[PDB]
Each structure stands twice: as structure tokens, then as C-alpha cells.
């Protein structure tokens, strides 16, 4: 049981692109040094989200075949995956300063209705003991979801997503042969990720008392 050379090449492009992602030192120092209040904590979350959307665009452009998709479908895929990819990355960083970041999130004026399933998701991500290949492929599968709103050529997106699901399943058989439910538990995280779209939309609606950044206003139609 091994990946074919073609699957190894596809996996290598995903990993290389995933490994490039960085949170700039200017933003990380703010987590340590800025004032502790609901207003300042919310502003830090906003800045981190903006940096992550930028990181998400750069990662997506290096995904094999993404730049061959219809230009407007590229926009529609980025807009529909931004929250899901941001939660998956948050889950990864939380499961590897961390005490102060958690404190800021819990004291950013965001309701427990949102915070509770969020920390519950980070917990279930941790129990999976995900490898970096699993984090990167799940991120790409989330981005390349053919069922997002306003996609014109869905079949073209299906052609890019299916081989990634084939690679992820093969890795599950190679690395966890005694746990045949491993792939199923990863799919469980895909469906759980989708629930954060409704929760995030309710947070943006109720926050009408606020400015965000132009990048966040664009992707979330604020």
C-alpha cells in the first residue's frame, strides 16, 4: 500500500504550499503585548482573520488546477471556504502564548453560543491526532467544495476535489491500517466545519454595534 507517483506529486504541491503559511511577528506580538479588554480582544481576532484570508488566497493559488478554474468560480470558492478554513487552522494551532490567545477569544465580546461549539471542535480535532498531510488535504478539500453558492461549473471543481479525497483515504489505509474508521472521523470534521458558517453569520449580524477590515467585509458580504 503506497501512493502512486502522480498522487505523491499532487500531495507534494499541497504540502509545500501549506508549509509556507505564516502569522507575521507584528500580529503575534500583539497577542502578547496589547491591552486585555473585549474591544481590544475583538480587534486582535479581526487582524488575525485578515492575515489568515491573505494566507488562504496564496495557498489556494498553488493548489493544482485551481488557477485553471473560471475566474468568478475562484472568487465563489474562496468566499464559501474562508470561515471553514479559518476554524480548521485555529484547531491545528490550538492543538500544537496559547493560554493568552484562548483568554482573548473567551473575552472578545463573543457569546458562549459560538465559543462553546468552537472549543468543542478544537477538542475533537485534538482527539484525532492529525498529521500535517491530513490538515493540508482537509483544508484543500474544504476549499475545493463543488457545492458552494454561485459556482457556474461544478463539474470542474469535482475533478479537482475527488483525487484529494482519494489521496486522503489512501493515507488513512497506509498510516492507520488497524483503525478502519479513521477516514470516517475526518469526514465527521468536514460536516462539523459546515456548522460554523451559520454560527459565524449570526455573530456578524449581532455585531451591528463593527468595522472589521476591507478583506473580511468582501468575503463575508458585510
Amino acid at each position: 500500500m503506497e501512493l502512486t507517483p502522480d498522487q505523491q506529486t499532487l500531495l507534494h504541491f499541497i504540502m509545500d504550499s501549506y508549509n509556507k503559511q505564516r502569522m507575521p511577528q507584528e500580529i503575534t506580538n500583539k497577542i502578547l503585548k496589547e491591552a486585555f479588554s473585549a474591544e481590544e480582544n475583538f480587534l486582535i481576532l479581526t487582524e488575525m482573520a485578515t492575515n489568515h484570508v491573505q494566507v488562504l488566497v496564496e495557498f489556494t493559488k498553488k493548489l493544482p488546477g485551481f488557477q485553471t478554474l473560471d475566474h468568478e468560480d475562484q472568487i465563489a470558492l474562496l468566499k464559501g471556504s474562508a470561515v471553514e478554513a479559518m476554524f480548521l487552522r485555529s484547531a491545528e494551532i490550538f492543538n500544537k502564548h496559547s493560554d493568552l490567545l484562548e483568554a482573548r477569544i473567551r473575552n472578545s465580546g463573543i457569546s458562549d453560543e459560538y465559543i462553546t461549539p468552537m472549543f468543542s471542535f478544537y477538542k475533537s480535532i485534538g482527539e484525532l491526532k492529525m498529521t500535517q498531510e491530513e490538515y493540508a488535504l482537509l483544508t484543500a478539500i474544504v476549499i475545493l467544495s463543488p457545492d458552494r453558492q454561485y459556482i457556474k461549473d461544478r463539474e470542474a471543481v469535482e475533478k479537482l476535489q475527488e483525487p484529494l479525497l482519494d489521496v486522503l483515504q489512501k493515507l488513512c489505509k497506509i498510516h492507520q491500517p488497524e483503525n478502519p474508521q479513521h477516514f470516517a472521523c475526518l469526514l465527521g470534521r468536514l460536516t462539523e466545519l459546515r456548522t460554523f458558517n451559520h454560527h459565524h453569520a449570526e455573530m456578524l449580524m449581532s455585531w451591528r454595534v463593527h468595522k472589521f477590515t476591507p478583506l473580511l467585509c468582501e468575503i463575508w458580504d458585510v
Binding site: 475562484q74 472568487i75 468566499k79 476591507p214 478583506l215 468582501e218 468575503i219
Partner: peptide, 13 residues
């Protein structure tokens, strides 16, 4: 003209 900054980030080399 919609998603001006998102298009800028996507379209730059």
C-alpha cells in the same frame, strides 16, 4: 466593482 481587494490578492503574481 465588487471584491476589489480579494480580486487584487488573487490576480497579483
Amino acid at each position: 466593482k465588487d471584491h476589489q481587494l480579494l480580486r487584487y490578492l488573487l490576480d497579483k503574481d
